[PDB]
Design a protein around this ligand. Structure first.
Ligand SMILES: *[C@H](C)[C@H]1/C(=C/c2[nH]c(/C=C3N=C(/C=C4\NC(=O)C(CC)=C4C)C(C)=C\3CCC(=O)O)c(CCC(=O)O)c2C)NC(=O)[C@@H]1C
Ligand SMILES: *[C@H](C)[C@H]1/C(=C/c2[nH]c(/C=C3N=C(/C=C4\NC(=O)C(CC)=C4C)C(C)=C\3CCC(=O)O)c(CCC(=O)O)c2C)NC(=O)[C@@H]1C
Ligand SMILES: *[C@H](C)[C@H]1/C(=C/c2[nH]c(/C=C3N=C(/C=C4\NC(=O)C(CC)=C4C)C(C)=C\3CCC(=O)O)c(CCC(=O)O)c2C)NC(=O)[C@@H]1C
Ligand SMILES: *[C@H](C)[C@H]1/C(=C/c2[nH]c(/C=C3N=C(/C=C4\NC(=O)C(CC)=C4C)C(C)=C\3CCC(=O)O)c(CCC(=O)O)c2C)NC(=O)[C@@H]1C
Ligand SMILES: *[C@H](C)[C@H]1/C(=C/c2[nH]c(/C=C3N=C(/C=C4\NC(=O)C(CC)=C4C)C(C)=C\3CCC(=O)O)c(CCC(=O)O)c2C)NC(=O)[C@@H]1C
Ligand SMILES: *[C@H](C)[C@H]1/C(=C/c2[nH]c(/C=C3N=C(/C=C4\NC(=O)C(CC)=C4C)C(C)=C\3CCC(=O)O)c(CCC(=O)O)c2C)NC(=O)[C@@H]1C
Ligand SMILES: *[C@H](C)[C@H]1/C(=C/c2[nH]c(/C=C3N=C(/C=C4\NC(=O)C(CC)=C4C)C(C)=C\3CCC(=O)O)c(CCC(=O)O)c2C)NC(=O)[C@@H]1C
Ligand SMILES: *[C@H](C)[C@H]1/C(=C/c2[nH]c(/C=C3N=C(/C=C4\NC(=O)C(CC)=C4C)C(C)=C\3CCC(=O)O)c(CCC(=O)O)c2C)NC(=O)[C@@H]1C
Ligand SMILES: *[C@H](C)[C@H]1/C(=C/c2[nH]c(/C=C3N=C(/C=C4\NC(=O)C(CC)=C4C)C(C)=C\3CCC(=O)O)c(CCC(=O)O)c2C)NC(=O)[C@@H]1C
Ligand SMILES: *[C@H](C)[C@H]1/C(=C/c2[nH]c(/C=C3N=C(/C=C4\NC(=O)C(CC)=C4C)C(C)=C\3CCC(=O)O)c(CCC(=O)O)c2C)NC(=O)[C@@H]1C
Ligand SMILES: *[C@H](C)[C@H]1/C(=C/c2[nH]c(/C=C3N=C(/C=C4\NC(=O)C(CC)=C4C)C(C)=C\3CCC(=O)O)c(CCC(=O)O)c2C)NC(=O)[C@@H]1C
Ligand SMILES: *[C@H](C)[C@H]1/C(=C/c2[nH]c(/C=C3N=C(/C=C4\NC(=O)C(CC)=C4C)C(C)=C\3CCC(=O)O)c(CCC(=O)O)c2C)NC(=O)[C@@H]1C
Lengths: 172, 73, 273, 162, 172, 162, 172, 162, 162
């Protein structure tokens, strides 16, 4: 697939050139943040189950019809699917976060997701909603850990957001 | 409309027709009952003999009537 | 069909191949002669770049033959937004129009009449523009001059077949897409006897024109919004005829002038004559 | 493209599992290494040219007959090519250092190497010398881990070529 | 069409709710930057011709073959098209920048663009390149103007970038 | 068993190639981390017992009714089991730290977890509390990376259980 | 599949008739040429490697950019493909030549080729060129062999050409 | 369709290799033989009709009851069909001789033979006689290799029918 | 081993069918040709040695530097080998002629050719010259079909080598 490093390379290749010193300095600094980056990911993975559980509860409190007969999250079978899906999306987001690149998430999951959902009759709107619900909860953890060295994670936090949002958008 | 030159590129004998205009012929792109323009109650268009029959028939079925026909030249 | 992932887990651009299946290629596990299943006469698989060569050869070495290949990125893309064509916009040329207002009608007329196709300064028609703006020509008459111009014949009519030129006309002169083969057939015949000029006239002359955008309104997209006497399929056709904004009708592209609306789709909406 | 980071993602994805401690450990390894890797790249990038000249040259010393008329080494076009190619190899090696995996090398250089070389009658041997000569020069400008890294990648090609 | 404001509305509508106070504060802030926002746009429009001219020169210095017989920017006719296209993309980008939203750009311009380019045989790679070349030059002006009250435009500058990049990506 | 070292071998092996720089980088990561990991294990191993008591206990506070007669928490046998189990979980967690991968956890604890639990009507919830309570205690005896590691693994189970 | 003989049969079948005596005489004479036909094929197969090698050299001398970074024949991997492809086409052509019929060539080989090339972004023009380059070299051998009985091969030579050309056309 | 020429192409194609000497040798064989084959076809084509009459007839002698009312051989329609059929078989045999392979026979006649015959209650036996009778007549008008060829194909059907 | 006869059997066997006329035609081809093939073999077999000397020699003229010390062509062992090898090529081309297929050539020589040559740094080029030189000589002792056959096979190797 692709990631921050690989990407820059590829660009450089088409110009036919060695990497610009400027460009190295992007990567150099990217490295420095690694440790932060990692912990961010770790936080998501660690709390995964919860993140979802939470988001779901909220999703269903809001859109009560999904769980009513005739809705899309009914019956059990469907409900299960819906949970599974949420998780997946999450997993991909995390992946991206580590890579430092949207690519993996979009190619593996998002590209074609909308249309699938459409054909099935799944309401894309609601899906998107769920993704956001997840986003907020997730950030919650990323941003409020214990026993990690205190410092500023904002930069990472925002990038995280973006990933979630690409998701939300393409699905929606 | 006075012809500045022969309008039509394809060439035959050309006739100037003046028509009373229904709202249907030139409805304005407006909400509510479409209104032909005030300024030109009588549109006047030069027409090749070949297209003269169609033009007349289409004018006829639409309310508007031929005020006068005059050879373009 | 929809593809769900653009790329394979191992890096690799997935391509979607479509084939006419053959009994050898897949067969039911029954006794008696081998049959494929009817619903998959045109089968579609998504293959990585690496396996593509071998997959295609196997298909061809059996009775299969490849209807088309297409990158899965392009496929599995949104159907075109209809935002700009849902409500067209609509341009009126008033009598006693300003210099600017005439300009804006000219541009609009080129855009609609020529498809997003670009018109160069040398291509543009001074003479017919000159007639508008001192009066003498209607918007409807200007439109008839464009569809008489060589520029128009070079693009839409001299490269493609009449069957495509027809729908291509239906779009430019009426927002609608064609509805029923009857329409395509009638135009083909009119063209044979009357010739190209009559055919062009018959759109502008027709009642849909004038009833909509009658005179002095540049034609705008009617399709994409429900019209009288318009089969539903027609609405789906419009999505084939109209791909996006900054999608065009181009003779310039590879195999430039093909038919967006498969002839079997027309026959669905109404077969007879 | 194979780098440490891409791989663990891939592996995680295949199983359908979240990135757990296992993979992060691996990642940590990469990025820690990077500091050395990066250094090496800065060094090669700078001296590029000079390395290239020296290499091309070397090859000719090693295989005099190449420069004779009717041979491959003969006539400027070919010399130009020969230069180009060696420069390309170096560029991929620099890329790989930075990427932190063989990936870049594999996909550009290695895959299809044989057949290209066969059809155009490029003798692997040549390239090799180029590389070796390089390796020797690099063995001055660099030291410690930075050096070690540079070698690894340079070699990786030698092995692929041979 | 759409823009920052309208967007937020729409979201709110589907929830079925009045706008959240938090959400207002996004827009409230957005307003405050207006003046900056505007000048940014003004800078692009003012320099338009140049931006392109420049980018082109560089594009052709790099990829000599485009202008050689058999290339894609040859002959004149094609060259013209290629210039025209660059401009268009720019035009849209600007629009977006004012709106405070990618949409207009995506829907009018990017949508279908890749496929067009493909059908024609236009090399998408090069197109993307051109877009970037443009980006850099453009930022150049946005960020270094004359007679304007000095302050920080970064926020805007980055958003500008993003637009250019969406372009680059979808074309590529 | 999945550890960093085993995986890179596996990946190398699948492609059919020698271990190149890519994999070694990864390995390196595992080894440098170990020092922290190892420390954590020594700490858990020592306080084992105390952690266990505390946990078991907790569970009962959390779910009083379990200790009532006719329930599962009731009668020593069950309490003994409950102890055993938590002790087993702890041992696997220590094992993982040392091995430097989830491997040990996956194979002993996780695989088949669900069905076991279903057939004997063990409620995941319980275990979870145990773990959480543990995590809290561990959050005193340890600090910095050692701690971080301990958590990762403990959690990994929480997630598997839930 | 099909070939000259089989073909004539099929035609005859739809009429529902025995083969016309006239028609036999087509085949009768076709047989007589066999020996010539064969040697033609033999010549191609014998020189195959070379044919390609040659054509390639010329192709790349002309279109320098193909082999430049960013071009279609770069990097190695791609180059390899491009060589492979050329060869294949050749292989088929030969097959046809023996069969005495285009079919085999059209159905196994040419069918779908264009579209593939398009999707990849491979420049069809260049492909076609290569095919011709091959053609000329190939004829070269067919027409100038060693140890063969001297006589007129033109008839075969032209048919050979046609095959190459069908190829060139359908690809292009 | 299976002829010598098509097959070698097929085989060559499968392995992915050029036609080499091996296959051409085979092809050559087909062409040399053709002269005899062709001759045979000219002979059958000419006497077609007469062969057909004789055959149809024969069948009736062999199976008198067929001509009785309420049977299959009875009433002109059926006789017409019976004629038609035998003529079709002959046409395919001539086609095969010329094509230089069983191909034509296989695809028209043989494939699906059984089921057709079953569903319409055509007894293979009949056809066979037809053929045999034919074979006997052909055994006069032809001689040497031409003959041999004719036989081969005629038989091939007998075997397929039975 | 691929010969005409083996192939048709193979094909027949795969489909699960008896050898019918189609295949025999092919076989016939192989046998008719043999007379020429056989002749060619007798001619090569006899002049073997002389061809070999001439070839080896040629190579050295073509690539003088080989005979210099520190090269491959240098020192008798290598020369002996070089001779041997070409003799192996010579004996196997003869085998193919007789067998009536490339078979013998394929598995004995062509298979694994590349990798052998790579690992021992034998340059295909050399062999090729050898062959070419041979081809030229053979182009005197033989004539007509016998010649044609000899060529086919000789070339087949050239192509495989390149
Ligand atoms: C949950 C938030 C919402 C919801 C989800 C939902 N999805 C399905 C069905 C499917 N879900 C997917 C999605 C994926 N499969 C994948 O492999 C991936 C990664 C590329 C995804 C994200 C698919 C494609 C299916 C079909 C396959 C399957 O069923 O397993 C359903 C069930 C509907 C059905 O008829 O199948 C549901 C309910 N819909 C909601 O109601 C929520 C708002
Ligand atoms: C950010 C979301 C929150 C945060 C992160 C943070 N982390 C560090 C420092 C480190 N983090 C790690 C973690 C890892 N390194 C690895 O190799 C792995 C996988 C095995 C992880 C999970 C490490 C080792 C460090 C170095 C020092 C340490 O003892 O942690 C910082 C400090 C800055 C830095 O990059 O060193 C920060 C800020 N902490 C917060 O408060 C944020 C909310
Ligand atoms: C017979 C009454 C008429 C007729 C039929 C006919 N069909 C074919 C070929 C096919 N027919 C089918 C049909 C099916 N396949 C299925 O699996 C099913 C049920 C699920 C059906 C009903 C198919 C798929 C084929 C094509 C592939 C195959 O062999 O299965 C033919 C032959 C067509 C050919 O040229 O190969 C015919 C003749 N046509 C007639 O002549 C009758 C009027
Ligand atoms: C006559 C030799 C055979 C024949 C012809 C036939 N065609 C139709 C109907 C149509 N033919 C066309 C085809 C075209 N589209 C184009 O653009 C062009 C010009 C390049 C052509 C030739 C079309 C569009 C039609 C539809 C109706 C029409 O008349 O235009 C028919 C009528 C049958 C029908 O409409 O279903 C016929 C008979 N078919 C035969 O039977 C002859 C062997
Ligand atoms: C220039 C950077 C590159 C390039 C471009 C190029 N484009 C065309 C042809 C077309 N380009 C477009 C573009 C658009 N249509 C739209 O409406 C929009 C947004 C609203 C865009 C950006 C279209 C419609 C066409 C087709 C019509 C036309 O005649 O232009 C070409 C010419 C293609 C041809 O073969 O004639 C070219 C060259 N190609 C390059 O060389 C640059 C890398
Ligand atoms: C230098 C030691 C010798 C030399 C080399 C030489 N190379 C060629 C031709 C090619 N070389 C390559 C190599 C690459 N092209 C790539 O894209 C890559 C991967 C990034 C590599 C390594 C290729 C592909 C070619 C083929 C055509 C081309 O020029 O690209 C030649 C020309 C030989 C010919 O007949 O084609 C030569 C001479 N030049 C010397 O003087 C040394 C002997
Ligand atoms: C940002 C890219 C660079 C920059 C801009 C900048 N502008 C202002 C302030 C103003 N700029 C304008 C401009 C307009 N307002 C309008 O209504 C229009 C269109 C009619 C324009 C072109 C105005 C009126 C103001 C306010 C008055 C003033 O100039 O003081 C600032 C100051 C911030 C603020 O307005 O609060 C800045 C920073 N200057 C830079 O340093 C950037 C490189
Ligand atoms: C403690 C929180 C609660 C409790 C536990 C309890 N467990 C069992 C029975 C089993 N527990 C396990 C657990 C494991 N054994 C293993 O080998 C592993 C993997 C290393 C685990 C996690 C198993 C497998 C059993 C079933 C077989 C057995 O008897 O060991 C029981 C008894 C249930 C029964 O039906 O007999 C109980 C009660 N007791 C408490 O007080 C808490 C409620
Ligand atoms: C060489 C003259 C030109 C060239 C060729 C080229 N081809 C590919 C990739 C493919 N080419 C094919 C070809 C075929 N598909 C078929 O069905 C047949 C006939 C049966 C052929 C010959 C295919 C399938 C591929 C895709 C899969 C593959 O691995 O080859 C490339 C590489 C494309 C890429 O981006 O990977 C190239 C370069 N292109 C040129 O530059 C030459 C002008
Ligand atoms: C045509 C491009 C050149 C040419 C051909 C030519 N060939 C012959 C005759 C024969 N050539 C062969 C070759 C084969 N027959 C086989 O069975 C096989 C496969 C193993 C081969 C390769 C044979 C046997 C003959 C017959 C005897 C002979 O060689 O003379 C002729 C003679 C005319 C004829 O039709 O017999 C000719 C003209 N000669 C040229 O001048 C062209 C350059
Ligand atoms: C002749 C020895 C006996 C005889 C035969 C007879 N045949 C039929 C009907 C059919 N025979 C065939 C045979 C073929 N049709 C084909 O397409 C081919 C391949 C070229 C063959 C060999 C078929 C298919 C039929 C079925 C329907 C049809 O109309 O042909 C009949 C009629 C039986 C019926 O119920 O239709 C008969 C009687 N007639 C005689 O006099 C002999 C006893
Ligand atoms: C002659 C052109 C050059 C040369 C030859 C030479 N060969 C070797 C080593 C080997 N030769 C072969 C070749 C074959 N052995 C086989 O089994 C077959 C197939 C039947 C062939 C074609 C082999 C396999 C070897 C490698 C192992 C061995 O010793 O047999 C050498 C020695 C190289 C070395 O020891 O590394 C040489 C020199 N000698 C010359 O003078 C020419 C340059």
């Amino acid at each position: 697939m692709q990631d921050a490093f690989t990407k820059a390379i590829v660009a450089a290749d088409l110009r036919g050139s060695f990497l610009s010193e400027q460009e190295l300095n992007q990567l150099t600094n990217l490295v420095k943040e690694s440790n932060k980056r990692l912990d961010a990911v770790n936080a998501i993975t660690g709390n995964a189950a919860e993140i979802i559980s939470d988001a779901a509860h909220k999703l269903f409190a809001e859109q009560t019809d999904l769980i009513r007969p005739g809705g899309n999250a009914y019956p059990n079978r469907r409900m299960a699917a819906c949970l599974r899906d949420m998780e997946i999306i999450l997993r991909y987001v995390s992946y991206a976060l580590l890579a430092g690149d949207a690519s993996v998430l979009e190619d593996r999951c998002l590209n074609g997701l909308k249309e699938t959902y459409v054909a099935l009759g799944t309401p894309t709107r609601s899906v998107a909603r769920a993704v956001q619900l997840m986003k907020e909860t997730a950030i919650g953890y990323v941003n409020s850990p214990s026993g990690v060295t205190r410092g500023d994670c904002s930069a990472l936090v925002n990038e995280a957001a973006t990933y979630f949002d690409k998701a939300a958008a393409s699905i929606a | 409309s006075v012809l500045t030159g022969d309008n039509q590129q394809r060439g035959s004998k050309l006739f100037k027709i003046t028509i009373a205009l229904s709202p249907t012929l030139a409805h304005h792109p407006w909400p509510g009952l479409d209104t032909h323009e005030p300024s030109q109650s009588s549109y006047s268009t030069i027409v090749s003999l070949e297209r003269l029959l169609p033009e007349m028939t289409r004018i006829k079925r639409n309310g508007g009537r031929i005020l006068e026909i005059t050879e373009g030249e | 069909m929809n593809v769900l992932t653009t790329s394979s887990q191992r890096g690799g651009k997935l391509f979607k191949v479509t084939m006419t299946l053959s009994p050898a290629l897949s067969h039911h596990p029954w006794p008696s002669l081998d049959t494929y299943e009817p619903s998959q006469n045109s089968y579609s698989v998504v293959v990585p770049l690496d396996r593509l060569l071998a997959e295609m050869t196997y298909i061809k070495n059996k009775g299969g033959r490849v209807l088309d290949i297409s990158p899965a990125d392009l496929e599995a893309l949104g159907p075109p937004d209809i935002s700009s064509v849902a409500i067209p916009l609509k341009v009126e040329l008033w009598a006693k129009a300003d210099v600017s207002d005439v300009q804006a009608a000219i541009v609009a007329a080129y855009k609609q009449i020529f498809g997003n196709t670009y018109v160069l300064e040398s291509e543009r028609l001074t003479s017919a523009e000159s007639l508008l703006r001192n009066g003498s020509i209607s918007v409807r008459e200007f439109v008839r001059l464009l569809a008489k111009s060589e520029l128009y014949k070079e693009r839409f009519f001299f490269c493609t077949s009449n069957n495509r030129f027809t729908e291509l006309n239906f779009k430019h002169f009426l927002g609608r897409a064609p509805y029923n083969q009857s329409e395509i057939a009638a135009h083909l015949d009119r063209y044979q006897t009357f010739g190209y000029d009559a055919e062009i006239d018959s759109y502008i002359d027709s009642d849909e024109y004038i009833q909509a955008f009658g005179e002095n309104v540049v034609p705008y997209y009617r399709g994409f919004k429900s019209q009288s006497g318009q089969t539903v399929e027609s609405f789906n056709r419009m999505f084939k005829l109209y791909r996006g904004d900054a999608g065009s009708d181009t003779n310039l592209n590879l195999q430039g002038q093909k038919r967006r609306v498969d002839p079997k789709n027309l026959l669905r909406s109404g077969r007879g004559i | 493209m194979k780098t440490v980071i891409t791989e663990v993602i891939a592996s995680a994805d295949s199983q359908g599992r979240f990135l757990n401690n296992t993979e992060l450990q691996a990642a940590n390894g990469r990025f820690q290494r990077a500091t050395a890797s990066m250094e090496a790249a800065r060094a090669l990038t700078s001296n590029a040219d000079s390395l290239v000249k020296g290499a091309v040259q070397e090859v000719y010393n090693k295989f005099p007959y190449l420069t004779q008329p009717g041979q491959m080494g003969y006539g400027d076009t070919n010399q130009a090519k020969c230069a180009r190619d060696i420069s390309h190899y170096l560029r991929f090696i620099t890329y790989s250092l930075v990427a932190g995996g063989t990936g870049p090398l594999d996909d550009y250089i290695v895959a299809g190497l044989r057949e290209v070389n066969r059809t155009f009658n490029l003798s692997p041997s040549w390239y090799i010398e180029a590389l070796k000569h390089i390796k020797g020069k690099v063995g001055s400008q660099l030291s410690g881990q930075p050096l070690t890294e540079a070698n690894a990648y340079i070699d990786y090609c030698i092995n692929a070529l041979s």
